[PDB]
Design a protein around this nucleic acid. Structure first.
Ligand code: DTP
Ligand code: CA
Length: 430
DNA sequence: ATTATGACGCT
DNA sequence: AGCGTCAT
């Protein structure tokens, strides 16, 4: 009733760059623009592995993880851009720097939480309040929402996509009460106005297009973002939740895409998020734990309280390389040489980070995978990171893992290593 | 023979 | 600490 929380206290957005690495390469090489194209890493093995795909290529069925040779079978005219290779490994610097471009623009509008290389959450609550004070009861023109979809609309008593968009937007605005400055629906709408502005600035100043979700929390914002890709934004109101969730597979919600989501489905014998409303909070806690149970109880009602964390920079800086099948490292000289290569890229990135961001990493994490292990990581050890020196870091990394060697022979390494990973962590101000 | 990342929860 | 899960 009057004490039942509705989770409408915040305005939160999720900005998601469209086929990001592809856009980066297309900006650099105009020949790739408006073409079926993909970004690949390495080229020797089956033409290389695809890590990003343009929407033109997706129409042919091209997907991430697909080998370029196989993608060509579906899309013979597919164009390709290769990830830069340095010191024998893929180097993602161009995309990290492009990410910084976008993140710094978004930061002008509000505090952001860097979710990934090309996603950021935004808490627009305060900005919306300010903007509402300028409007002063003034209605919101549909012209201020040129790329916005209102989920669930149109509805009630045109066969084209854009036509439908406008009809929904019209119904939404027609029902708004611009008279109430505390109206959640109004707040969401102003949030979307600001996101239009943010997305316009991103495209103007970088050339990159993106999609966005606007709602009352991170999970709904994220879900909304994916509803109308690419180059569009979607508003998901609290009111839209029941119908939206009624046919929404549980795996579509952030954090429920893996084993937990599978267990929710199996244990409860349900398929859709909405079906969760029929269980008490205690019931959910009993199956999935105190934390998960509470989260699920609230989430299926469109309520979540995870805050947009003020963090624009990554917490860690890591370098990793796989050594599949026959290429698995089997000698001591091999292991040492590749640790050095990884350590050299790491030193380079750490030094840049220290100059730009006034901080120093204090811990070096070393991870390896042994041939046969199904897990991505077989072992993880840490040592002190006291100096940004590649030779020292590689030596220290070898030291902490050198006893993983079974070979009675000092020169041979067994079982062969199929993955090396160096990660700098635990930053302090400098 | 996907690969290269990155954040956070559990114990 | 070291491992697992989930995500771009
Ligand atoms: N599994 C992966 N391995 C390596 N790189 C990845 C992987 N997933 C994503 N990336 C990289 C390439 C992507 O361009 C970028 C952002 O990923 P993601 O948001 O999942 O898709 P995308 O931006 O390419 O397409 P979309 O338009 O659907 O968002 O990060
Ligand atoms: Ca993206």
């Amino acid at each position: 009733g009057p004490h039942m929380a509705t989770g409408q206290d915040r305005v939160v957005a999720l900005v998601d760059m469209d086929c990001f690495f592809v856009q980066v390469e297309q900006r650099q090489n105009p020949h790739l623009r408006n073409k079926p194209c993909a970004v690949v890493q390495y080229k020797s093995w089956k033409g290389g592995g695809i890590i990003a795909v343009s929407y033109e290529a997706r129409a042919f069925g091209v997907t991430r993880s697909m080998w370029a040779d196989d993608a060509k079978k579906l899309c013979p005219d597919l164009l390709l851009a290769q990830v830069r290779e340095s010191r024998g490994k893929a180097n993602l610097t161009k995309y990290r720097e492009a990410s910084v471009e976008v993140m710094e623009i978004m930061s002008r509008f509000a505090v952001i939480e860097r979710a990934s290389i090309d996603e950021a959450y935004v808490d627009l609550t305060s900005a919306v309040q300010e903007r509402l004070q300028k409007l002063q009861g003034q209605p919101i023109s549909a012209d201020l929402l040129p790329s916005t979809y209102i989920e669930g609309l149109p509805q009630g008593p045109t066969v084209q996509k854009e036509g439908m968009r406008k009809q929904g937007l019209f119904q939404w605005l027609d029902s708004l009460q611009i008279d109430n400055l505390t109206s959640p629906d109004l707040q969401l709408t102003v949030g979307a106005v600001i996101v239009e502005e943010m997305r316009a600035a991103i495209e103007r100043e970088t050339g990159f297009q993106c999609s966005a979700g606007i709602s009352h929390n991170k999970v709904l914002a994220k879900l909304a973002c994916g509803l109308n890709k690419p180059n569009r934004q979607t508003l998901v109101s609290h009111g839209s939740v029941p119908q939206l969730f009624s046919q929404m597979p549980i795996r579509k919600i952030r954090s429920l895409g893996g084993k937990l989501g599978a267990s929710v489905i199996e244990i409860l014998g349900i398929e859709y998020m909405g079906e969760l409303t029929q269980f008490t909070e205690s019931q959910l806690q009993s199956h999935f734990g105190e934390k998960n149970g509470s989260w699920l109880y609230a989430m299926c009602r469109g309520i979540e309280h995870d805050p947009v964390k003020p963090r624009q920079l990554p917490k860690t800086i890591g370098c990793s390389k796989n050594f599949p099948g026959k290429t698995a490292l089997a000698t001591r000289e091999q292991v040492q040489w590749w640790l050095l290569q990884l350590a050299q890229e790491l030193e380079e990135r750490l030094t840049k980070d220290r100059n730009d961001n006034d901080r120093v990493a204090t811990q070096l994490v070393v991870s390896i995978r042994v041939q046969g292990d199904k897990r991505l990581s077989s072992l993880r050890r840490c040592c002190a990171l006291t100096r940004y020196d590649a030779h020292k870091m590689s030596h220290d990394a070898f030291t902490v893992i050198k006893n993983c060697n079974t070979s009675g022979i000092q020169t041979e390494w067994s079982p062969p290593l199929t993955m090396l990973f160096l990660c700098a962590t635990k930053f302090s101000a400098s």
